[PDB]
Design an enzyme around this catalytic site. Structure first.
Site, short mmCIF file in Angstrom:
data_model
loop_
_atom_site.label_atom_id
_atom_site.label_comp_id
_atom_site.label_asym_id
_atom_site.label_seq_id
_atom_site.Cartn_x
_atom_site.Cartn_y
_atom_site.Cartn_z
N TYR A 1 0.94 -1.19 0.18
CA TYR A 1 0.12 -0.16 0.01
C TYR A 1 1.06 1.32 -0.07
O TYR A 1 2.15 1.09 0.44
CB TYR A 1 -1.07 0.02 1.24
CG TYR A 1 -0.19 0.44 2.57
CD1 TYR A 1 -0.10 1.64 3.23
CD2 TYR A 1 0.45 -0.50 3.20
CE1 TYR A 1 0.56 1.77 4.26
CE2 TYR A 1 0.97 -0.56 4.15
CZ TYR A 1 1.23 0.79 5.12
OH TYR A 1 1.78 0.77 6.18
N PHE B 1 -5.76 5.80 0.18
CA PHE B 1 -4.88 4.55 -0.06
C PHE B 1 -5.11 4.06 -1.48
O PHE B 1 -5.96 3.99 -2.01
CB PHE B 1 -5.03 3.49 1.01
CG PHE B 1 -4.77 3.87 2.51
CD1 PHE B 1 -3.60 3.67 3.13
CD2 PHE B 1 -5.88 4.21 3.23
CE1 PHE B 1 -3.52 3.83 4.25
CE2 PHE B 1 -5.65 4.58 4.46
CZ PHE B 1 -4.67 4.47 4.93
N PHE C 1 2.20 9.70 3.28
CA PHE C 1 2.82 9.49 4.88
C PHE C 1 3.22 8.16 4.86
O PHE C 1 3.82 7.84 5.93
CB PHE C 1 1.51 9.94 5.70
CG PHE C 1 0.46 8.86 5.48
CD1 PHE C 1 0.47 7.64 6.23
CD2 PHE C 1 -0.72 9.43 4.77
CE1 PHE C 1 -0.80 6.90 6.15
CE2 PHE C 1 -1.79 8.58 4.66
CZ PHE C 1 -1.74 7.16 5.51
N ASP C 2 2.91 7.06 4.04
CA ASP C 2 3.55 5.76 4.29
C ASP C 2 3.70 5.13 2.89
O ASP C 2 2.70 5.23 1.91
CB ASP C 2 2.79 5.09 5.27
CG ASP C 2 3.52 3.86 6.04
OD1 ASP C 2 4.71 3.86 5.83
OD2 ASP C 2 2.91 3.20 6.71
N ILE D 1 -7.23 0.02 11.01
CA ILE D 1 -8.69 0.99 11.06
C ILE D 1 -9.77 0.32 9.97
O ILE D 1 -9.75 -0.24 9.36
CB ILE D 1 -8.23 2.51 10.18
CG1 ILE D 1 -7.72 2.37 8.66
CG2 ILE D 1 -7.29 3.35 11.00
CD1 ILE D 1 -7.66 3.52 7.95
N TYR E 1 -8.89 7.41 11.86
CA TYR E 1 -8.22 7.89 13.14
C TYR E 1 -9.26 8.96 13.85
O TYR E 1 -8.79 9.70 14.88
CB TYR E 1 -6.75 8.21 13.01
CG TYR E 1 -5.87 7.05 12.80
CD1 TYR E 1 -5.65 6.02 13.77
CD2 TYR E 1 -5.47 6.87 11.50
CE1 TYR E 1 -4.83 4.98 13.16
CE2 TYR E 1 -4.92 5.83 11.18
CZ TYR E 1 -4.40 4.79 11.91
OH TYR E 1 -3.70 3.91 11.74
O1 LIG Z 1 -4.70 0.88 10.53
C1 LIG Z 1 -3.46 1.20 10.23
C2 LIG Z 1 -3.23 1.59 8.76
C3 LIG Z 1 -3.87 0.92 7.97
C4 LIG Z 1 -2.73 -0.27 7.63
C5 LIG Z 1 -1.43 0.03 7.37
C6 LIG Z 1 -0.68 1.29 8.31
C7 LIG Z 1 -0.40 0.45 9.73
C8 LIG Z 1 0.93 0.46 9.68
O2 LIG Z 1 1.68 1.58 9.71
C9 LIG Z 1 -1.04 1.27 10.89
N1 LIG Z 1 -2.52 0.92 11.12
C10 LIG Z 1 -2.57 0.31 12.52
C11 LIG Z 1 -2.16 1.24 13.59
C12 LIG Z 1 -1.54 0.59 14.81
C13 LIG Z 1 -0.91 1.52 15.61
C14 LIG Z 1 -1.16 2.60 15.60
C15 LIG Z 1 -2.10 3.23 14.70
N2 LIG Z 1 -2.47 2.35 13.41
N3 LIG Z 1 -1.87 2.40 8.61
S1 LIG Z 1 -1.68 3.72 7.92
O3 LIG Z 1 -3.03 4.35 8.09
O4 LIG Z 1 -1.08 3.55 6.95
C16 LIG Z 1 -0.55 4.52 8.95
C17 LIG Z 1 0.76 4.66 8.74
C18 LIG Z 1 1.72 5.33 9.50
CL1 LIG Z 1 3.24 5.53 8.85
C19 LIG Z 1 1.21 5.70 10.63
C20 LIG Z 1 -0.13 5.55 11.12
CL2 LIG Z 1 -0.42 5.90 12.73
C21 LIG Z 1 -0.90 4.76 10.19
#
Ligand SMILES: O=C1[C@@H]2CCC[C@H]([C@@H](CO)CN1Cc1ccccn1)N2S(=O)(=O)c1cc(Cl)cc(Cl)c1
Length: 128
Positions: A45, A118, A55-56, A75, A101
């Site tokens: 992703y 995403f 952001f990721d 999420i 969030y």
């Molecule tokens: O639910 C998630 C979602 C969806 C899956 C992929 C990522 C993971 C892995 O970073 C993070 N999480 C679960 C999660 C775990 C702990 C804290 C916050 N969110 N995220 S994300 O939205 O890309 C994300 C990516 C990054 Cl770098 C930081 C955050 Cl807080 C959230």
């Protein structure tokens, strides 16, 4: 761009029909099967904020993101959205904050009340 297009032209995949999670299938996947609850799913992703910033990205880590579907490990928009995907599918997912969030955000990267975009590729899914 792609976020605008999913916002304006995407399918509402929420059970409530509250337009909280919108989807476009970008690359059609294999057959008809989608993962089931509790499956181990492997995805690649990238995520963007509504200010345009990436952001990721799992691609940039050279390894997939792995989670168990339908367990609140991610999420809400991801549990809902990945459950709709076929193996090999690539989709775009627009996630309103109520399915992400919320007002809290997730510091440092995710602000309050953030709509997230995403691109997700479902690599594989397997029962354990
Ligand atoms: O639910 C998630 C979602 C969806 C899956 C992929 C990522 C993971 C892995 O970073 C993070 N999480 C679960 C999660 C775990 C702990 C804290 C916050 N969110 N995220 S994300 O939205 O890309 C994300 C990516 C990054 Cl770098 C930081 C955050 Cl807080 C959230």
């Amino acid at each position: 761009g792609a976020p605008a297009t999913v916002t304006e032209q995407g399918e509402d995949i929420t059970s409530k029909k509250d337009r909280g999670v919108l989807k476009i299938v970008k690359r059609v996947g294999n057959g008809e099967e989608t993962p089931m609850i509790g499956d181990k799913v492997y995805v690649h992703y990238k995520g963007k904020l509504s200010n345009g910033k990436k952001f990721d990205s799992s691609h940039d880590r050279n390894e997939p993101f792995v989670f168990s579907l339908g367990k609140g490990q991610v999420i809400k928009a991801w549990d809902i959205g990945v459950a709709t995907m076929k193996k090999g599918e690539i989709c775009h997912l627009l996630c309103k904050p109520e399915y992400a969030y919320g007002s809290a955000g997730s510091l440092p990267k995710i602000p309050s009340n953030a709509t997230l975009f995403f691109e997700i590729e479902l690599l594989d899914f397997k029962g354990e």
